[PDB]
Each structure stands twice: as C-alpha cells, then as structure tokens.
Amino acid sequence: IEQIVVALGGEFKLYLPQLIPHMLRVFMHDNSPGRIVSIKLLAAIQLFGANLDDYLHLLLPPIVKLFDAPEAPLPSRKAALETVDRLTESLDFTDYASRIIHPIVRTLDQSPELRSTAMDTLSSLVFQLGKKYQIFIPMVNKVLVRHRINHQRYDVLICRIVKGYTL
Amino acid sequence: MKDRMKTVSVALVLCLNVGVDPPDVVKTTPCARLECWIDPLSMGPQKALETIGANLQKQYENWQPRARYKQSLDPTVDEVKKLCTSLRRNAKEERVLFHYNGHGVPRPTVNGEVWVFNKNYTQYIPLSIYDLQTWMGSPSIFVYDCSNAGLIVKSFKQFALQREQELEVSMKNCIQLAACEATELLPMIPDLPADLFTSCLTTPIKIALRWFCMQKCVSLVPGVTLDLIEKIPGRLNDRRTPLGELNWIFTAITDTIAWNVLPRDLFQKLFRQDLLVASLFRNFLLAERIMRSYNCTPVSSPRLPPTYMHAMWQAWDLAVDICLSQLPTIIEEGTAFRHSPFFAEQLTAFQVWLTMGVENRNPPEQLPIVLQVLLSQVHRLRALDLLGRFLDLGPWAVSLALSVGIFPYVLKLLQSSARELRPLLVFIWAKILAVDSSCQADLVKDNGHKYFLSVLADPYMPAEHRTMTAFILAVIVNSYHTGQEACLQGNLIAICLEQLNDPHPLLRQWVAICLGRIWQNFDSARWCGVRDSAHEKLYSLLSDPIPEVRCAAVFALGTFVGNSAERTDHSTTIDHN
C-alpha cells in the first residue's frame, strides 16, 4: 500500500474507499504482540497525505481512541500522537478542535511519560487555528499550573495570539 | 490611492515545438494534450502553432483589450532580445508583462538558465536569467508555465540581490507567478488540459465547471455531465444570461476572500491598483485551490497566506449546485431562466449584523459583496439603504467604508435621472463629507453640485433633506475659489433668500451660514447680494428667539462687511448704513 501510494499521485483518491473498512477492522480487533500491525498502518497513514480530505471524519476517531486508552502499550500511544502531529501539516483541523483537545487534556493526567509528546502535538494544532483557539485558553491553563508543564513554543504562540501576531 | 499605474504591452513567448518530446519526459498512452483548448495532433505543426498563438491572444484580450500584444513562437535569443528591448523602449515607465511557456524544452537548471531553440531547430540553447532581467525594465510582471518553476523565482531573487551587492563596489517593483515548486512535476492526467495553470489564470469559469463535474459531490445532482456543460448558454458579460451570473458571483466571492484574509497594505497594493493584476491575482486563488488536489503548489513573489480552507468556498459550491440543476429544462424544453438568491441572502445577513453590532467588534464579512451590487437596477435601493444605515454608527465606519473602496461607485450614481435616489445619496454624501472635507474638489470637477442644487430648489422636499443639502453645499464652497465661482454661476443667493424664513430653525441657521460663506473673499458675490437686497432680509434673523441663528446671522453680516475693499463711495455708503 505504501509503495502504491508513492507511485500514484492525486489519483489514489479513487481507491481508498475500497480499503477503508479493512483499516477500521484492524484498529478495532488486533491480537498481535504489542500491536505492531497498528504501528505500521499508522506509518502508512502518515504518507497518505493531502488525500483523506473526504474521509478524515472516518479515520480520525479510532486513532484518538488509541492514545487515550489506559490499557494499551506506550509505543502505540506515541505512534498515534505523532501520526496526528504529522497529519496536521497538510489537512484542516478546525471542525475537530473539541474532539482532539478534550482527549489530550484527559491523557495529560494519569501518565507523565507522554507529557512532552502530548504537548508537542498540542502546540502543532494551536498554529493551524489562531483566534479560533481563544475559547480554550483558560481551561487548559488550569491543568498546566497543577503539574507545571512548560514549552517555549506553546508559550510564545499564546502571547502572540493574545497580542495579535503570527509567524 | 495616489500611486496609479497601468499595463500597456504584452509579449507571448511560446516554446511549443509540436511533434517532438524532449529527452526528460516519458508520456503515458492517452496523456494530456489540449493546449488553449486545441488538440495539436489533429493538424499540421505550423497551423497548430499559429492557432494556439491566436487563441492565447484572444484569451488574454478578454481581460485587457487596450494593449499591444506581440507573439514569439519557437524563438531564438536574438529575437527575444529585440522584442524585449523594443517593448521596453516603447513603454517607457509603464508596466510590462512577460509570459513564458516551456512545455517543449528541457526543464530549467540550477545555474539560472532557461532553454530556447536555434535557427535550424536542431539544438537547445541556454539563456541566462541575468540577461533576461537586464533587457526588461523595472516595473514588470512575469508568468512561468513549466515543470520546476520555483528555481526561476529563486534565481531571480539571487541575481536581484547580486545586483545590489555589485552596486556597493530590480526586484523593487517586479512581480512573479509560478506554476510549481522547485522539486515538483506538473500533473498529466488525460481528463485535464496540458496547460492547467494558464487555463486557470485566463479562463476561470470553464475549468471551474469542468473540475466541479469531476468531484464526488456531483452525485447530488441528477443528469448533469460534461456534454451539457459544453453547451452552457449566455455570454460572459451579460449579467442576465446563465453564464454571466456565475462570473459575477465568482468575482464577488474571490474579492471577499481576498479582503478577509490579507493585511490592508498588501490588499491595497495587489487588488485595487491595476485591473489586469487584480484579475490575475483573483484567478490565482482558484488556481491554488484546484492544483492543491493534484499534489502541486503554485508560488508567487509577494507571498500570500493559504486560503484553500476559507468558508466562503463552500458558498460557491452551493451556488453552482443550484444553477446547473435547471440546465436540462432550460436547454431542452425552452424554459425560462430563474435568477439565483445569492445576493438577497448575503444582504439579509448584512442586515442581521446591524441590529446588534453597534460596538467595535469584528467587522462584517459581507462589505465587499454589498459594494458589488450598487450598480444593479434590482438591488440598488436596498443596498443603498443598508449602506446609509451602516455609515451612521460613527467615524470609524466611514473610514472603513472608504478604505474598502466605496468612493468611485457613489460618485458615478450622481449622473442618474431616477427620482428615488435623491434622499439616500444626500444622506450618504452628508455623512461622508462630515468626516473628510478634501473631496470637495472631486465634487466640483465633475459637476456634481448640479444634483444637490436641483434638490435644494424643490419646496416639496422634506426640511431635513434640504438641511443636509445645505450643509453639503456649505462644505463644498468653503475656502475654495473654484467652488465659489461655480456655485455663484448656479445662483445660490436667490435660493438662499427664498427659504431663509422657514419655521425649521436649523435650516435657517445653515442657509445663513452658507450665504455668509459664499461671498467670503469674493467681490462678485457681494455685488450680487447688494443688488438683490439680501442683508435687508438677513436683518430679520437678528431677533430670532434661538441664539444660534442670531450668531449665524451676525457671522454672515460680518463676512458681508469684510469683503468691502475700500471701493467707491456707493459701497462705503452701503457699509455705513
């Protein structure tokens, strides 16, 4: 699948629907040791690229469900977080602000391992939004003071948005 | 907008060389072949090359008929040099457009060179970007349609910097448009033209409809296909045919997006100074949106933020959806065409904004759309009323409305015979002039005063509108000799005397103020007033119950006396009386 994707250009859009169901079945029922099939599938979805415009509402929920579950192993959680972080560079994430911000804040607690990766992913979104982020500035701050999370990147953006600049 | 400019000349360089493929490319079996909507393989090379050259000129002429077009098909270095030098010499200090298409030669090189032919058509000769920049003048706009177009922009900027490094021992007014990124290849799908970028830049609606017919959403429309699109009836300039309304809507939507996304200075620079530049940049957004879906990314010299995700595009998809639904009945059963509700709903949203939005919050998004419907006989009245209501909030609203480019539109409606536009135009002009008084000259040069005068002489006009007209006239003539003379030629004195005794007090006050102003530092007006028995009536206001009218009358009398330049004994006697 990876090789076919790299072969075809924008024409790959005409065949993804035939394969979507099989991707959905894998993330749902996976008995592999450590769920390495899911990691490889995420690696491919990273390449999928500027396609997925008409199906981002089908794939996205499962992936999120992966990095909020407490029972799954850490590597898959990191893979999912990095997958979202990479996908943000080409697609649009203005209609799913609440459906990614809430699970991220939930995952922040109960685990200190995914701290840095979680906020690395977070800072990425706040950059595709600008003013559209204002609503959420207070709430997340409450969690930030409790565990004292710091991130130069995330901090600069907040100041610029509050003052009216961007890079 | 002081820095006006124009474009006068166009050069069309075409490196087609039909019939032979360069070494770099291996092509599929169907392949994309259309060029300017012509198949080059259904004819002979020379005829195809001439037909393409003519069609390109026609398409460019659709947007700028008053220019000199010169073609250059499969040229050599000397011909290019001669053409560029002659064009620059003829144009002097105006702008010049350069258009390059390289679909028949090898791709550009990292050394800053582009390929041309030799006299025998047996070799490819390099040509340095440095010499091409040398032969062209300072104000210029370049368009590239080739595979690795980004390299050309990068090399151009490098050499522009070098020409400044070597001066310490021309980009300051140059614009560039490119079709690809430095490491990308143009798409070749059999369903698309082989010249996607230029087609987008020059014929937006055709490619827009063809693209819409290829998407997954078309399933919501029954019985619409490419053949029906081929036979859309109408003309691009007839706003009542099916094909002109789409162009109107496209213009409005693109202008709205551009105003909403860009900063003020860049918007003024690119979208309000020159017509051809504005049209090219408006089509640039459609080019970006369309080409993003085939793994391609256009580039520009003054970089712009992304716009493919703006909400207004959704609106576009809706409008087309409706318009194409009527096509079967329209074409087969001769049914009449039904006009779209786009502008009515936009105006409704603009109206909804006003009821609550007094405060200085984010401005409304539909101002440019409102500005696009003033000159239509259907929506003129409602749009004018809404604009008048908007302008009353405060000076900031007036400043914003002037900034968005409202001035030339209102100045053109004064030359109309309709009897219903009078109060609305009076209100708008009063509100505008209350803030900025420099417009007076522009009002007199084009003899707009006539209009207002024809409103002040009607006794059936309500008193408030007459007062506003009097204020407009008073502002026009203040400290402006040309206005003084022009309004005296209209005999404003007699009309001022006629309505000086109306019950409405502020009308009396402003009439007195304008009458006093007209003959300030102007002897002919004073002679007219003396001859027509003006101050004798003016004395009556010296006992008005309202003090402000009294003060205005005193000011008028003082101005009257001041004009007396120690003339003969008759003027002295009148002054002493």
Place this chain on the structure above:
Amino acid sequence: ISKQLPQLTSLELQYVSPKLLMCRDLELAVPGTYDPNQPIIRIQSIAPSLQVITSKQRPRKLTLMGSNGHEFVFLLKGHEDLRQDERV
C-alpha cells in the same frame, strides 16, 4: 489555398457532415457484402474521423462499424470513374 491545403491531414465529421454523425443502427447493408444465401449485415455507425492519404489526389480512409461486430475499411476516391473496374 495552395499554401493552406498541404496541412489538412485529417477531417472531423462534425465540421463536415453531422448527418452521418447522427446515424445509428441503419437498416442498410454494408457496401459490397450482400449475398442472397448468407445473413445480412448492417452498418452500426461510422467512425468520427477520416484520415487523408498524402498524395496529389488526396483519397480518404473511411471506416465503418458493422452490426456483426467487425470493422470494415474503405478507400473513398473522387475525380475518378470506376465502372470499367466493375466490368473487369
């Protein structure tokens, strides 16, 4: 005309004869195929393009699609009497 001519290398039916373009499932048999013993074969439609052989006479290369399911190619000559060939 002398200089315009040499570049005509093909003809499109739509600029030449839309009548033929509209034709579909005729009841006319393919030329030069009727035999009173075999079943009849009709012309399903005509191809849209004509190829002009480069010569002085400039004959065309017409092609028809039969109802049987096979193509039939012909040479269309003009300025030439072709009855002595029939007799021979």
